[PDB]
Amino acid sequence: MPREDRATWKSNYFLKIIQLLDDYPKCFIVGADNVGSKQMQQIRMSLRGKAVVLMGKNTMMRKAIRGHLENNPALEKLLPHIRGNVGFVFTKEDLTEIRDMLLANKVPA
Amino acid sequence: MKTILSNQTVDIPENVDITLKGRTVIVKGPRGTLRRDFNHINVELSLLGKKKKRLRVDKWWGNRKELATVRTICSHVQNMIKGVTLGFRYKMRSVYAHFPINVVIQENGSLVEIRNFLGEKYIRRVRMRPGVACSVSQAQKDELILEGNDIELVSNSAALIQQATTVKNKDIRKFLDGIYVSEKGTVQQAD
Amino acid sequence: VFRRFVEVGRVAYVSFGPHAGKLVAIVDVIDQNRALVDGPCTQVRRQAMPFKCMQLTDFILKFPHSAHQKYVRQAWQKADINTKWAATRWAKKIEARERKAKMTDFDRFKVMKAKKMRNRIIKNEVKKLQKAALLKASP
Amino acid sequence: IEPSLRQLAQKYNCDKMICRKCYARLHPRAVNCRKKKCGHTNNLRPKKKV
Amino acid sequence: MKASGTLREYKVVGRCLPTPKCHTPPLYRMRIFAPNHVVAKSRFWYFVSQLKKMKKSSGEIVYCGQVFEKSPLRVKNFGIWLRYDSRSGTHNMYREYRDLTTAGAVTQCYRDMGARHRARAHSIQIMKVEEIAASKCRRPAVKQFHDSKIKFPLPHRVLRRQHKPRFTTKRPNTF
RNA sequence: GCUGCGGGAUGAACCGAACGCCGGGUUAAGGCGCCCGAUGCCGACGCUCAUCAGACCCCAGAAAAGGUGUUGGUUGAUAUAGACAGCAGGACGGUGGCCAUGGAAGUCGGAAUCCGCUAAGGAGUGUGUAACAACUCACCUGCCGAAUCAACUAGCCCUGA
RNA sequence: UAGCGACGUCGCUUUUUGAUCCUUCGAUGUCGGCUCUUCCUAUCAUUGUGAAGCAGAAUUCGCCAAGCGUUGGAUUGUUC
Ligand SMILES: [Mg+2]
Ligand SMILES: [Mg+2]
Ligand SMILES: [Mg+2]
Ligand SMILES: [Mg+2]
Ligand SMILES: [Mg+2]
Ligand SMILES: [Mg+2]
Ligand SMILES: [Mg+2]
Ligand SMILES: [Mg+2]
Ligand SMILES: [Mg+2]
Ligand SMILES: [Mg+2]
Ligand SMILES: [Mg+2]
Ligand SMILES: [Mg+2]
Ligand SMILES: [Mg+2]
Ligand SMILES: [Mg+2]
Ligand SMILES: [Mg+2]
Ligand SMILES: [Mg+2]
Ligand SMILES: [Mg+2]
Ligand SMILES: [Mg+2]
Known part of the structure; x- marks a missing residue:
């Protein structure tokens, strides 16, 4: 809130996003309408092991990875990005099986 | 601070066809035609677009009051375009205590005649506006629906009804009786 | 509109003031009420004049914003404002008003004799044509 | 007596703000008496319930 | 000051008289906006008497000169620091004006402080005049004039009361 | 007083200016819509609308206080890491945590109060079922597009009258 | 803060009384009542309204408002 404070306000999310920036290929673009019930733990618990799911404000994330990129690629997740409640489980695992488990595995399952 | 050229953007849909002869605006649509006179307002009116029908409302210089004025033309043109497509519909549930209220439409939808109104003997004959119809609606207890084109005329009629039903010399936190506007909407639904 | x-x-055009009858080109607007104008060929030097002083007309140019006298003169000569200005009815009206002010008595004498001759020819041919219009609408 | 219709009638005649200086009925969100007879004060009070 | 006509900028330098207690006084310099050099010489003593131990019999005014405008054909943006004195108490003020010359800007300042806050030519002290660059003007009027491709017409322009005869059959077509 | 004259309509004392009788010219204090001589200036800049406007030393009626009426100004706080209100989503869990067993499963009352998940949830601002429950607020995220919010001050006008 | 409101504080009024002596001492007939006309509003009632600790009634407090009313008597010369 004074920018970074070295506390958990603003530039700790802009430490986590930009320090969990050098461990992955494949942001996955999970989005749910409401998570107010135990759906939060239904997001994390079933996908644990590799449990991530971290993205704050998409308004925060406009010029964020642009200005603190130094990663060239993966900025082609551009303006198709902002819109929609997106949670971003950026992963490092095998193929589409992640999305397959989520193709339903939190809200009715 | 003597600003410059504030401009409002009024989209026009495909069905309605607009035509202005000055500050007098004449709009045609499926549900009749309509017109107003914006003579006393002194604002540039102009339209642009071959069959896209964009309207811009533009006022130069001015004051802060006149920058407040330039949005009101936009909002009235919006309401006229909503009316000439759809038309406005006011749904009024009559709220009655131990006494009922009888409401009849006396002649041709225009005249509304209210009776028995807390046991008052005085028959209350209220004359509505030209260009608006009134009907006692079906499938609902004492709901009264006013339908018309010009929203000023229709809502002036609704105000005339609710100020015809007004309780004198009592508490008005008790004696909650009258005919009140419950819902504002369109003639054709889902639009 | x-x-x-x-x-x-x-x-x-500059209607009232120390520059009556002289074209200027508007360089830039200072603040709402006066503006900097300049004339390269119409003999008027770069200065700030009010808006109610000046009279607007319809020719435009292509200036950079706040250019020099040089580029104003270049666009002036390349657009040919003076000849095209004299070839409009507005300047014909101004020219006629100046000639009417700069008449003399012998000129007014010739004007009245030509005026009488023209109005007599008008009167005769108008009376003949409206008589012919009556004779046309008579059947 | 229909409590939803009671909510409607109380919406039209009860939940208003009353100014202490001009005594005029205004609006539930309003801050200022619009009348000239007091002069646009910010001195209000809620309308009393039963 | 009466601020009559149009203002003029004077550069005025002056010093105390040399005493045996102090040879060569520091010879100060100010920038006075005045209708003429006499009002400039008096207003110079008025400021320097507030700032340092000086008065008109104590010292001398060495040079008093007109400051010709360094860039007259340019349209400049001026910031003025005002120390007007109201009925209740004195204040500070930062005003902005878009105008040609410094003298015209200070004239617009006096006229606008006469018009808005009813402050006469008594109470106004001009602290500092600074030609400020574009895009740092705080005020919204000068900010909205900061545009190229500026377009406005001249709406409802009416004029010439009785420049015609007082009686005519024309009724004027304003625009 | 002992003193006219030009202005302040009107006056002893005010502001100019003091007196023989006259012709020309110039001004002072004041004033220049018409009474009434002069702005019949293509005057310069802004402010204010009054349902009791305002209009010139002496002077022939007004204050304390208030105004999201407008116009400036000061000091802070937010806004590109997207505020501001508007539309849309939620508003948990260890945990029916704890005082109670009159309810209380955050909602009359009491002590308190940590942590996790996160986008954030206040061991929960309240709506309302006597209570269980939907529901909102605090807090959070999308569409949005450039200024916004909070105090304070003084000019005109309005209330006070 | 519906209605009041101390401690303080800013005004208005000339229907109380007081202060002053500016006008008249070669005279302005001095109290009260009877009658009679008009005006003000700082509204007691009536018309139209809003707010109440306004359920109804009866009240209280405000606003536009002076059009129209505001009496009969015992006492005292009385105003009161
Ligand atoms: Mg009652
Ligand atoms: Mg004597
Ligand atoms: Mg003497
Ligand atoms: Mg004398
Ligand atoms: Mg005299
Ligand atoms: Mg006078
Ligand atoms: Mg006299
Ligand atoms: Mg003479
Ligand atoms: Mg004079
Ligand atoms: Mg005259
Ligand atoms: Mg104000
Ligand atoms: Mg006043
Ligand atoms: Mg005496
Ligand atoms: Mg006496
Ligand atoms: Mg006598
Ligand atoms: Mg006598
Ligand atoms: Mg007598
Ligand atoms: Mg009367």
Whole structure:
């Protein structure tokens, strides 16, 4: 809130996003309408092991990875990005099986 | 601070066809035609677009009051375009205590005649506006629906009804009786 | 409506003041009420004049914003404002008003004799044509 | 007596703000008496319930 | 000051008289906006008497000169620091004006402080005049004039009361 | 007083200016819509609308206080890491945590109060079922597009009258 | 803060009384009542309204408002 404070306000999310920036290929673009019930733990618990799911404000994330990129690629997740409640489980695992488990595995399952 | 050229953007849909002869605006649509006179307002009116029908409302210089004025033309043109497509519909549930209220439409939808109104003997004959119809609606207890084109005329009629039903010399936190506007909407639904 | 609004580089006439009858070109607007004008060939030096002083007309140019006398003169000569100015009815009206002020008595004598001859020819041919219109509408 | 219709009638005649200086009925969100007879004060009070 | 006509900028330098207690006084310099050099010489003593131990019999005014405008054909943006004195108490003020010359800007300042806050030519002290660059003007009027491709017409322009005869059959077509 | 004259309509004392009788010219204090001589200036800049406007030393009626009426100004706080209100989503869990067993499963009352998940949830601002429950607020995220919010001050006008 | 409101504080009024002596001492007939006309509003009632600790009634407090009313008597010369 004074920018970074070295506390958990603003530039700790802009430490986590930009320090969990050098461990992955494949942001996955999970989005749910409401998570107010135990759906939060239904997001994390079933996908644990590799449990991530971290993205704050998409308004925060406009010029964020642009200005603190130094990663060239993966900025082609551009303006198709902002819109929609997106949670971003950026992963490092095998193929589409992640999305397959989520193709339903939190809200009715 | 003597600003410059504030401009409002009024989209026009495909069905309605607009035509202005000055500050007098004449709009045609499926549900009749309509017109107003914006003579006393002194604002540039102009339209642009071959069959896209964009309207811009533009006022130069001015004051802060006149920058407040330039949005009101936009909002009235919006309401006229909503009316000439759809038309406005006011749904009024009559709220009655131990006494009922009888409401009849006396002649041709225009005249509304209210009776028995807390046991008052005085028959209350209220004359509505030209260009608006009134009907006692079906499938609902004492709901009264006013339908018309010009929203000023229709809502002036609704105000005339609710100020015809007004309780004198009592508490008005008790004696909650009258005919009140419950819902504002369109003639054709889902639009 | 409002066909002619001011701009960077629109020519203008100066009606009342120390420069009556002289074209200027508008360089830029200072603040709402005066503006900097300049005339390269119409003999008027770069200065700030009010808007109610100046009279607007319809020719424009292409200036950079706040250019020099040089580029104003270049666009002036390349657009040929003076000849095209004299070839409009507005300047014909101004020219006629100046000639009417600069008449003399012998000129007014010739004007009245030509005026009588013209109005007599008009009167005869108008009376004949409206008599012929009556004779046309008579059947 | 229909409590939803009671909510409607109380919406039209009860939940208003009353100014202490001009005594005029205004609006539930309003801050200022619009009348000239007091002069646009910010001195209000809620309308009393039963 | 009466601020009559149009203002003029004077550069005025002056010093105390040399005493045996102090040879060569520091010879100060100010920038006075005045209708003429006499009002400039008096207003110079008025400021320097507030700032340092000086008065008109104590010292001398060495040079008093007109400051010709360094860039007259340019349209400049001026910031003025005002120390007007109201009925209740004195204040500070930062005003902005878009105008040609410094003298015209200070004239617009006096006229606008006469018009808005009813402050006469008594109470106004001009602290500092600074030609400020574009895009740092705080005020919204000068900010909205900061545009190229500026367009406006001249709406409802009416004029010439009785420049015609007082009686005519024309009724004027304003625009 | 002992003193006219030009202005302040009107006056002893005010502001100019003091007196023989006259012709020309110039001004002072004041004033220049018409009474009434002069702005019949293509005057310069802004402010204010009054349902009791305002209009010139002496002077022939007004204050304390208030105004999201407008116009400036000061000091802070937010806004590109997207505020501001508007539309849309939620508003948990260890945990029916704890005082109670009159309810209380955050909602009359009491002590308190940590942590996790996160986008954030206040061991929960309240709506309302006597209570269980939907529901909102605090807090959070999308569409949005450039200024916004909070105090304070003084000019005109309005209330006070 | 519906209605009041101390401690303080800013005004208005000339229907109380007081202060002053500016006008008249070669005279302005001095109290009260009877009658009679008009005006003000700082509204007691009536018309139209809003707010109440306004359920109804009866009240209280405000606003536009002076059009129209505001009496009969015992006492005292009385105003009161
Ligand atoms: Mg009652
Ligand atoms: Mg004597
Ligand atoms: Mg003497
Ligand atoms: Mg004398
Ligand atoms: Mg006299
Ligand atoms: Mg007078
Ligand atoms: Mg006299
Ligand atoms: Mg003489
Ligand atoms: Mg004079
Ligand atoms: Mg005259
Ligand atoms: Mg104010
Ligand atoms: Mg006043
Ligand atoms: Mg005496
Ligand atoms: Mg006496
Ligand atoms: Mg006598
Ligand atoms: Mg006598
Ligand atoms: Mg007598
Ligand atoms: Mg009367």
